[PDB]
Design a protein around this ligand. Structure first.
Ligand SMILES: [Co+2]
Ligand SMILES: [Co+2]
Ligand SMILES: [Co+2]
Ligand SMILES: [Co+2]
Lengths: 329, 329
């Protein structure tokens, strides 16, 4: 009791977060896009309605909180998040940071300037809303670009000043987490403040246990993603991969079996609208996973239970781990 | 009489446009940036105040209208434009199109989809404001990227449907205008609907007269840009170049002397805030050209008069040419 986390509806006690999905999106887009071209999504109204239906379905399955890791350059619309959170009665934690599509006005900035931006979104509020970010999202796609090095350093500095955790996008097959770790540690950031994400995109347990041993949280966060049976769709293949959800879920058990139950975070990386990829990708996704953000509780958790993972362990992964991660520390 | 152009304050008669600067910016930024980080500019209030002071200075020097060619990805804020236009009593024509920093949500789009976006901003309104674009801005930096080819085609299609003109950013030293012309003509766009911009960044009159002969408008639109005396500043050198404003202004006379007075558009490419380049670039610019958008009437026009260009010719360049260009045709 006592510790608090910021959500799009204001502060909540850490203990009320409950079953928490730590890497999710209401909408995957671009800065200013929803404001300029809402018809891309049918309408803003239709997008909101779809998101509310989706979050209510997750809620029914026992999800109490999601962390929307959409940054500025993912086109995060905090007003939209607040609206859908209110209508579905599911907590949403918003993010600061930068993903891999920053515009020039961000790309030209120094580490000091980026630190000031991230601190603004955490301490003051996002835009003119007063809604405060509760996590910092960063990204590499292979070896960090020079700018990405600055972003990771600024994220470490903002985290040290505020206690808010850092979470990452990686190219997992390229083992980006090792370089990300080195950068964070060079700034004196504690590994317990960091989740190395998309770590279920690889079956390389040497890579994953190496990180877990050092105290990093390992994000197994793309559970429903698979293009099995859609191999003729090049764009779906490239984004989803050729590994089954069962293959992804097996990594949760693998890390538990190797003593790392306290180092695992589980999610879908789902969304309800998606403009930063090919047209109609959302329709393809909705066909692969009609359950959306209820997929983890409905399919993954029972799968693990049937493999013999104890209820206490599953509760520790889906409740205790997100709570420790999100609590400002 | 009769013909109309759309401005940020609504429709105006073409004949009231008067002395018009055809390539300008209130603020050079990025989509969503002003909303997310207004403190970059001191504040939104300070930016607006500076812009109002600047436009009032231009107005005093005889400027009646500017065309703000900031696109979505230049971080065009049409509400800001409306506010400053009202306060300074200077007409501002807003733009649609895409410059060279489009985010993924734009880069993934087809020619048909881009055409729909440009038509939305021209026919329906920008964002939720009802303010209609009166020009389409496009850009290459050397040979067009595959996406840039789509953008130029969509611009041609939107222009053919609405009569609104198209204006371009080029790498002038790379003679981009020739490829841009070929793309536009392949879509059946009339050259009289097109301005090939930043054409004063080169002294190549073979290139420029080639375009003018075909009926293109030639944009001599960076008049005050020079890093002479600032050669120790690498970023200023790269952006401003090493040619004097007099050297740029001489090209106006050159084209007049070769029979092309009706094919010339003159401007500054100035701005009052600038986040898409190095920090404090605005301070450097304000030192080089304290007159801002009054520089053309105060310095360039008298320079040309003193070289013997008749008043009637100068009036044709600064009034008649913009009127014919902007009138939907
Ligand atoms: Co990602
Ligand atoms: Co994601
Ligand atoms: Co330009
Ligand atoms: Co410009």
């Amino acid at each position: 009791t006592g510790d608090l986390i910021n959500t799009v509806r204001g502060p909540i006690p850490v203990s009320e977060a409950g079953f928490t999905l730590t890497h999710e999106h209401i909408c995957g887009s671009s800065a200013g896009f929803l404001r300029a071209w809402p018809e891309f999504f049918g309408s803003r109204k239709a997008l909101a309605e779809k998101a509310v239906r989706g979050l209510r379905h997750a809620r029914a399955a026992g999800v109490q909180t999601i962390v929307d890791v959409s940054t500025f350059d993912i086109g995060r619309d905090v007003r939209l998040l607040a609206e859908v959170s209110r209508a579905a009665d599911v907590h949403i934690v918003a993010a600061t940071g930068l993903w891999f599509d920053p515009p020039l006005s961000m790309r030209m900035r120094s580490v000091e300037e980026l630190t000031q931006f991230f601190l603004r979104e955490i301490q003051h509020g996002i835009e003119d809303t007063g809604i405060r970010a509760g996590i910092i999202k960063v990204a590499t796609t292979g070896k960090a670009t020079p700018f990405q090095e600055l972003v990771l350093k600024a994220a470490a500095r903002a985290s040290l000043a505020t206690g808010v955790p850092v979470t990452t996008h990686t190219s997992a097959s390229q083992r980006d987490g090792e370089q990300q770790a080195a950068i964070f540690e060079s700034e004196g950031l504690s590994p317990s403040r960091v989740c190395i994400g998309h770590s279920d995109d690889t079956d390389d347990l040497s890579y994953l246990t190496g990180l877990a041993a050092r105290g990093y949280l390992v994000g197994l966060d793309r559970m429903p993603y698979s293009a099995i049976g859609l191999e003729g769709n090049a764009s779906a293949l490239a984004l989803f991969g050729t590994r089954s959800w069962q293959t992804r879920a097996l990594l949760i058990k693998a890390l538990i079996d190797r003593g790392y139950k306290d180092r695992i975070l589980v999610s879908h990386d789902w969304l309800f609208g998606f403009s930063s990829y090919v047209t109609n990708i959302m329709d393809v996704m909705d066909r692969i996973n009609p359950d959306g953000m209820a997929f983890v509780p409905l399919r993954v958790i029972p799968f693990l239970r049937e493999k013999g993972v104890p209820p206490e362990t599953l509760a520790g992964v889906t409740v205790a781990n997100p709570a420790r991660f999100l609590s400002p520390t």
